[PDB]
Amino acid sequence: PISPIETVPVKLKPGMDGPKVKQWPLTEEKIKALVEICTEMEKEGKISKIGPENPYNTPVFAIKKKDSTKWRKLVDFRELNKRTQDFWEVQLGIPHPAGLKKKKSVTVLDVGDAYFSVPLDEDFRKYTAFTIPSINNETPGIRYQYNVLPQGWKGSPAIFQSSMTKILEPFKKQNPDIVIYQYMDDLYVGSDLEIGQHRTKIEELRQHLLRWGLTTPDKKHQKEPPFLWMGYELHPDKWTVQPIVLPEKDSWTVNDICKLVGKLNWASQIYPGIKVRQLSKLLRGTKALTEVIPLTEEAELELAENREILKEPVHGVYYDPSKDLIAEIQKQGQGQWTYQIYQEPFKNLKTGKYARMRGAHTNDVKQLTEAVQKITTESIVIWGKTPKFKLPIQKETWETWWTEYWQATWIPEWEFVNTPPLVKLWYQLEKEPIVGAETFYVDGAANRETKLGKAGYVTNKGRQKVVPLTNTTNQKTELQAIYLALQDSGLEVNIVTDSQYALGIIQAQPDKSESELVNQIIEQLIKKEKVYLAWVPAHKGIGGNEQVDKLVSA
Amino acid sequence: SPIETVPVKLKPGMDGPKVKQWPLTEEKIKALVEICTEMEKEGKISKIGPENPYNTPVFAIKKKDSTKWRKLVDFRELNKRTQDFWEVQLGIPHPAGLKKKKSVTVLDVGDAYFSVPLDEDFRKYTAFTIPSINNETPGIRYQYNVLPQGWKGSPAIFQSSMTKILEPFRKQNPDIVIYQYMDDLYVGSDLEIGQHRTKIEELRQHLLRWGLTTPGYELHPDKWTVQPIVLPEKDSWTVNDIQKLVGKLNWASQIYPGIKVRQLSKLLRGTKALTEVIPLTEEAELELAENREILKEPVHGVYYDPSKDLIAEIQKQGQGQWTYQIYQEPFKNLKTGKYARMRGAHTNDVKQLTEAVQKITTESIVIWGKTPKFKLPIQKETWETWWTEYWQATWIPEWEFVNTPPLVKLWYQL
DNA sequence: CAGTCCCTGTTCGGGCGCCG
């Protein structure tokens, strides 16, 4: 029936009315159902019939449920929602199979017509008015309104969830040693008691819910391990995701690629080393999700590559609060990375990827940090703690990167993991001038109205050179100039610059950039055996400065 | 003595806070929870539901050398939405006396605040959502009935009944200056700790059996103040070794307009070789020690306008070295200092940067009764990740994240 | 001084996945 639980106060958006839209024709199938449902509800009192006095109306329909055979009534409360107040969603995130701890006794149990058991505020009921049309569409349609939370109303969730808790509170309060991973209406009930005491207690829970108006129909996995929960299969000692079929085709569209990458993304939590950089890059050209995109070799692999990883069946284990938490990462290639968390050598709790290209000029160590970061986070959202790491970077590569970096950066208790490809800097700029080294004086300008420009330098050996520029910027110049001074320099150099832009970009020790030019600049710096770089206040009479700037001018 | 509740309006033209609660350790959830239950079991708070569109983040802080915990909420979002209440209507003068005051002492007493009901029509804004590990149970909400610590109005109201509680001392000890910020109370004096510390133990029993309860302690920020802009001393001066001191003394000019370049700038005009040692002039070398004479003479133009926001930029100088510049306007730093790693501490960027951010601010207050908007040198995500781990100040200053390298070897370096 | 440009970040929202 309907539960006693007190209802939740809900107002409309200040100075606004209720819905008032009609009903679009529905198949004779739906209607044939929408009725059979309502009859049952009305009689059960889940909704009362309304007359002329209710000046409101919103549209409905039905979508089939999982198993099917049964229908789900839904109301297009789109409008009402916009017109309703706001709510503070109370579902913070999602639980993770890898977060469950070992239990001697587990069971699960969805709740029957959840939404339709929780009372909906007396007043608001007006708006929830809707109409069930007929077959021939001649005789007027039947008009009703809800008393219990309607399916698809901007607030239903938060209210159901809120409600439930309050309802379970007493039971939880009186049986602390029982855990209950509640998700909306689905209930995960574990404990460490014997089949006896446990199933005994389970029943108590069950009657208590029913007592409060909540139904636990036989759709409750008992001694049914593998319990089905949240998309996984809960075995006594391990879990896993359910069938994760990928779409096998020939003519690919943006939509497809989307349902693909997404589906793979779901996998990435357990099947190690999934990757999508290439496939999802295939979705930069904002277009119709119907628009046929061309699959590229580059990515054609990434598909079939991952398509293989999914052939191997896999599983994960659960959490032990006694053993420590390890996280180890590896570099999958193009700025991508794959980590796996665990406590036991080849007993993976969870696995995860990371391919966020942050910035325009970065390095592996920069990324390898924002990984630790991302990991640290979720590992707390899941285990409420911070995992020790195993990093493919040398205790010293790091020691260097921070004591020498200007910004503050940190990485939790970790330890080296010798296993390529290892991480490291590809060049450490000289912190002092290299004696007996053709000290260069670089610079380059550009006209912002013609988009043309010049770039060049000079040296303590008089050596002079300059190059013309197309569409270049007041920026592209300085660089373009630093680019040559390298190729026009041997193992040991000494370039001096006025521009901060390029100096800073360089001091970052980048080794990855979408900036074409910057690439070579780096690559060159890698070939050189030593390079010093200093800065001088541009446009102020300074030795060597003058001449260079002077030379390149328009 | 709890009768009257003061009406509080949200600065019209606005709306309330709606900031999501972020991840917390399991030590902290089991924390807040054991707190938030007692706090409800004594009506300071009351559970609430999802029909309330408001939220403000929270958390705990095990107190330094104090085994017990202490709740805490990031009301920064509220205070910014209820300033006119505690700004225009309930302003604040200028307690300059503590600045110069020998030895000060910070004493937190916000604990009192809870013995004063809060405007009901307002409470709906003090909403905060405790969370759950691995997301077992949905968020557990709440609301305030009394005065929430860390709120700026909280003191702004209690301010009255406070003064009164303090007369049996303030007047019988006019020497000692007493200030109140947020949840903290300052006891600036001009005596020795052999007394000053014992005088605090007296201000304790006064506040104790008067109703309130209070959980390198002392401070004397004046015994530090600003710092120099020190220059390099050599017997030799290379091309660059000069091209540097020149560039620096170029920016150092915008702060001090009385610095000269020409004599030390003409030391070369050709594409000279960087390492060519060239100590080269009578007037240039005289100029050096001159521009060097200006860096001893504290700048001019610094006018502290309490009608604008204090900023603060900082620098990572290796080895626990952090340099800052408290300032309201471009190149006019009403104060600048340097922070050195405390004794015994380990090398951890954030752990430090924070401690810094704090002292910087602790000072800021006892020197302007305000907090500066730090322009941090770290990565959002990095900061946002561990900071909370190291904090301890019952308050939380504004802050932004920026990235800009040291090209003029920092006028402040060492 | 402004009015610009470059270049670097942040935010927000859209589409899909997964859960109920």
Add this chain to the structure above:
DNA sequence: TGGTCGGCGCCCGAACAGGGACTG
């Protein structure tokens, strides 16, 4: 025939935002 809602993840794009160098 395809149409609802709340959570979170990911990718991407767009709208901002702030400095530095120029110009006017």
